[PDB]
Design a protein around this ligand. Structure first.
Ligand SMILES: Nc1nc2c(ncn2[C@@H]2O[C@H](COP(=O)(O)OP(=O)(O)OP(=O)(O)O)[C@@H](OP(=O)(O)OP(=O)(O)O)[C@H]2O)c(=O)[nH]1
Ligand SMILES: [Mn+2]
Ligand SMILES: [Mn+2]
Ligand SMILES: [Mn+2]
Length: 321
């Protein structure tokens, strides 16, 4: 029910104040606080994002929600507590982790991501699927980013929320991320209503490139204008900002932004030039990709940009399309 949903949100927003105090003021939170500060988190940013710490007692959240008069079983359903199936007892789902509030599109806290700071597994522990937290629908930072996305007529998708937090601080405000999932049909439906331009900036490794190609292809099929920013090898936005600074980052992002077709053929460059079988297959693929582009202006430029990779003229490629 909507009433139960509201209680679940309340639980999240009330415990947030407690997590925040635990992180910034208490003895047990000291090491977690140092970890964040060494990663460049100022006290202002921690306060701004409402970042906190979950103690290791296993009944910190439980006792708090109990004292406030919340139904314990509902707290379990809200994904704040876990349940011992043998004894049917309840305990904290989040223990000894740095707590990042996950807000819905309306800016209400509906879940948490808890990061280890002592090399534990998993590195990031998210809320499970609940009536108020659904990974296929939630986009991290969307609540804050919406205004700039509409103003700039562009959304930038990163791999993880940590990169979003850093990028936002650096001056790139139209950024979001999924909670460790592939971009869903629901997400795409949400995004489409805000803008027709989406830029993918995943990590600069093999997995990021593969994800760029898969996500990009799907977005293209859905009729969106897809762009790609390619980070230096082995780097993500958080690492770039930490190494080169804020101004260097926002300049980099503004510099090399390629249409998806151009990015795709540049990745396939060597195979195309050496494998005649791949040459023919990718010529057909890129032709199809370019045909999907809704922008007549960008379509024509993609033709000019892609043709040299196949050693054909723009006119010949246009004919193939
Ligand atoms: N041992 C362990 N590693 C994890 C876990 N979760 C994520 N990682 C790895 O941490 C690396 C980067 O994490 P990300 O998902 O990119 O998020 P981050 O913003 O980098 O978090 P962070 O800054 O480290 O706190 C990746 O290495 P790759 O580049 O090889 O990933 P891949 O197979 O994609 O090449 C992940 O595989 C985990 O639960 N356990
Ligand atoms: Mn990676
Ligand atoms: Mn990363
Ligand atoms: Mn990282």
């Amino acid at each position: 029910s909507n009433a139960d949903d509201l209680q679940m949100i309340e639980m999240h927003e009330l415990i947030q104040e407690f997590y925040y105090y635990a992180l910034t003021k208490t003895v047990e939170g000291e090491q977690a606080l140092t970890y964040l500060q060494e990663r460049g988190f100022t006290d202002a940013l921690i306060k701004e994002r409402g970042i906190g710490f979950a103690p290791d007692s296993s009944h910190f959240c439980h006792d708090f929600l109990q004292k406030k008069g919340y139904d314990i079983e509902l707290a379990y359903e809200a994904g704040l507590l876990s349940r011992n199936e043998e004894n049917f007892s309840y305990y904290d789902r989040f223990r000894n982790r740095i707590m990042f509030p996950l807000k819905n599109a309306q800016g209400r806290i509906v879940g948490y991501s808890g990061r280890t700071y002592t090399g534990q597994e998993p590195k990031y522990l998210n809320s499970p699927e609940t009536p108020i937290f659904q990974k296929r629908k939630l986009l991290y930072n969307l609540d804050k980013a919406r205004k700039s996305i509409r103003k700039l007529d562009e959304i930038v998708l990163l791999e993880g929320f940590m990169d979003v937090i850093k990028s936002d601080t650096a001056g790139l405000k139209n950024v979001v991320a999924t909670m460790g999932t592939q971009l869903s049909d629901e997400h795409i439906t949400f995004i489409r209503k805000l803008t027709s331009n989406i830029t993918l900036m995943f990590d600069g490794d093999f997995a990021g490139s593969e994800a760029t190609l898969k996500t990009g292809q799907h977005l293209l099929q859905q009729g969106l204008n897809v762009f790609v920013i390619q980070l230096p090898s082995g780097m993500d936005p958080d690492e770039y900002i930490g190494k080169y600074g804020n101004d260097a980052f926002t300049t980099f992002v503004k510099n090399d932004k390629k249409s998806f077709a151009h990015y795709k053929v540049s990745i396939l460059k060597d195979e195309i030039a050496h494998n005649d079988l791949s040459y023919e297959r990718y010529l057909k693929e890129l032709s199809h990709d370019i045909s999907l582009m809704k922008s007549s202006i960008l379509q024509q430029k993609a033709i000019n940009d892609v043709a040299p990779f196949f050693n054909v003229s723009p006119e010949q490629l246009a004919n193939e399309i």
